[PDB]
Design a protein around this ligand. Structure first.
Ligand SMILES: O=C(O)c1cccc(NC(=O)c2ccc(C(F)(F)F)[nH]c2=O)c1Oc1ccccc1F
Ligand SMILES: O=C(O)c1cccc(NC(=O)c2ccc(C(F)(F)F)[nH]c2=O)c1Oc1ccccc1F
Lengths: 135, 402, 10
């Protein structure tokens, strides 16, 4: 069977129920609340289509090659994917995106991390030296 | 879509602190230090998130070395005190690992010696230990259980009419094999004899059990595979034949049963079907000892050598030379091989180096340990210690943590 | 040899 998903824009997606129920949130709205279509006020059409594509392909240990290519997006889009995976309760998608952010942090100096994420250093000289002394 | 985004500030700002904490939980220690110095909010997320406590907990969960030191040093008391305590504790644990690894490499150790005080026939053929006790099988036909801390004898189990040659225990039973050709099952708590298996025609030289099944092997050149529904309900499943001499040792997992014999061969059997798989040739004399886990088989032989094998293709990956007499017992973990010989000597080998075909042979034996005055019959070890037993009627505890 | 192991000799 197919279930209609309704994005925050209003665009409706026809998705197989087995793919839709990878979202625990959508599964609850189907099984416990008996809702058709499934409104998703927190997910726009662009991210929802991206999420459906990920869910169909994963009908995940660490990050495979397909997921790395799937996550070759800007940090704003990666942020929106984390939010959608949280809102929809897709543990697999939340794990791969969070591991991806950690991979952008590891093996870098603090200044290299700042440059990666466009972060301004707001420590005072005394505070930074103290944090540096304690590690 | 924004080009860049401060995930670690943005997530707590919207009430999703745990997601930001989960991202940082993937970091190694040095990257966690780097994250601390990114900006004030990144520091607050790691601190309010107790990231250093979580890093130490993840290590305790995934590394027996960290797990063992948490118990032995007592800082595991605080796991599962502010964040700064765990940040300051982490380097103390690191240097504590490095002092232990240095002690293994240099053989700095303390020594405890149990005199088993055998009245007539001296010698300790087999042993297994935990943090509470050492269970030992003796040439005087008894099993003696020693307190790991006080070294005193807490229980003597009698019933065998010959030497206790092999043993293993879990949380419910001790199982022993003997020169009297029987296998016996004992209550590990009370010592009560629960079952006796009459089957082998000659001495039961080795046994292993796990997850409801047991393999026994004998001087009668056979292996017996048993199904254990309970300590009192043990059924013979299959008899494996094919060895042309005494079967001195047997080990197994869910994939394979591995046996080795005076006939100079190791034989591989399918655990599920008990069908023969392959013969490992290479040792020039009989094989006295063996351990198998994952894909690795390690064997010791009367030819004075140790051989490493891959179970799937049967290839010998490395020959270890150095022992001056028969290699009588051998164990390995993720880091080391520890072997004992007929000349009373114990050798520690670098397993990672031994599995690298580029490493030279002279760099493989880390140390030789000489404190037994007779043949070394059995040993077991972990990250911190070796426990060994000998024909000299002693059990030694070599402790590499000071 | 000890009682725990045996060779392939007769
Ligand atoms: O080398 C092995 O690892 C090996 C391992 C187990 C058994 C044998 N072999 C024999 O027990 C054997 C018995 C009888 C005959 C006979 F009658 F045909 F001449 N040949 C034989 O080889 C092995 O081989 C040799 C061992 C010793 C010397 C030469 C060998 F090659
Ligand atoms: O080459 C030899 O003819 C040879 C010559 C002298 C001594 C030995 N053997 C041993 O003294 C010996 C003692 C203990 C063990 C044991 F327990 F580990 F399995 N194995 C051994 O082989 C020899 O070897 C074999 C002889 C007979 C059969 C199989 C052998 F390989």
């Amino acid at each position: 069977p197919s279930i209609k998903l309704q994005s925050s824009d209003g665009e409706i997606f026809e998705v197989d129920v087995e793919i839709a129920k990878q979202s625990v949130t959508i599964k609850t709205m189907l099984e416990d609340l008996g809702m058709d279509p499934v409104p998703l006020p927190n997910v726009n059409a662009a991210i929802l289509k991206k999420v459906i594509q990920w869910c169909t392909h994963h009908k995940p240990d660490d990050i495979p090659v397909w997921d790395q290519e799937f996550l070759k997006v800007d940090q704003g889009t990666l942020f929106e994917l984390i939010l959608a995976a949280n809102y929809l309760d897709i543990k697999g998608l939340l794990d791969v995106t969070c591991k991806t952010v950690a991979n952008m942090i590891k093996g870098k100096t603090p200044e290299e991390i700042r440059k990666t994420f466009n972060i301004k250093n707001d420590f005072t000289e005394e505070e930074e030296a103290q944090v540096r002394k304690e590690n | 879509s924004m080009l860049q985004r401060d995930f670690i500030t943005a997530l707590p700002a919207r009430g999703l602190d745990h997601i930001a904490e989960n991202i940082l939980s993937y970091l190694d220690a040095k990257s966690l230090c780097a994250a601390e110095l990114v900006c004030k909010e990144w520091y607050r997320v790691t601190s309010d998130g107790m990231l250093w406590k979580k890093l130490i907990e993840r290590m305790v969960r995934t590394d027996s070395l960290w797990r063992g030191l948490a118990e032995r040093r007592g800082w595991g008391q605080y796991l599962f005190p502010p964040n700064s305590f765990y940040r300051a504790l982490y380097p103390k644990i690191i240097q504590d690992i490095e002092t232990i690894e240095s002690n293994w490499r240099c053989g700095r150790h303390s020594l405890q010696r149990i005199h088993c005080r055998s009245e007539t026939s001296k010698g300790v053929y087999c042993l297994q230990y935990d943090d509470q006790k050492i269970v030992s099988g003796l040439r005087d036909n008894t099993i003696k259980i020693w307190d790991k801390n006080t070294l005193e004898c807490k229980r003597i189990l009698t019933g065998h009419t010959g030497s206790v040659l092999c043993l293993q225990y879990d949380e419910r039973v001790i199982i022993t094999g003997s020169s009297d050709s029987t296998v016996r099952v004992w209550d590990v708590n009370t010592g009560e004899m629960l079952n006796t298996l009459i089957h082998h025609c000659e001495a039961v030289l080795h046994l292993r059990f796990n997850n409801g099944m047991m393999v026994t092997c004998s001087k009668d050149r056979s292996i017996a595979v048993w199904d254990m529904a309970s300590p009192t309900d043990i059924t013979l499943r299959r008899v494996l034949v094919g060895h042309r001499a005494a079967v001195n040792v047997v080990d197994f997992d869910d994939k394979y049963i591995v046996s080795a014999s005076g006939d100079r061969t190791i034989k591989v059997w399918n655990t599920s079907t008990c069908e023969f798989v392959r013969t490992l040739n290479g040792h020039k004399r009989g094989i006295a000892c063996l351990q198998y886990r994952d894909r690795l088989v390690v064997s010791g032989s009367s030819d004075n050598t140790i051989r490493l094998w891959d179970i799937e293709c049967g290839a010998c990956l490395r020959v270890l030379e150095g022992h001056e007499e028969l290699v009588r017992c051998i164990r390995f973990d993720n880091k080391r091989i520890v072997s004992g010989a007929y000349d009373g000597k114990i050798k520690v080998w670098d397993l990672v180096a031994a599995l690298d075909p580029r490493a030279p042979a002279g760099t493989l034996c880390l140390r030789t340990l000489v404190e037994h005055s007779g043949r070394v019959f059995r040993l077991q070890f972990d990250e911190f210690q070796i426990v060994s037993s000998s024909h000299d009627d002693t059990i030694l505890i070599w402790d590499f943590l000071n | 040899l000890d009682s725990g192991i045996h060779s392939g000799a007769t």
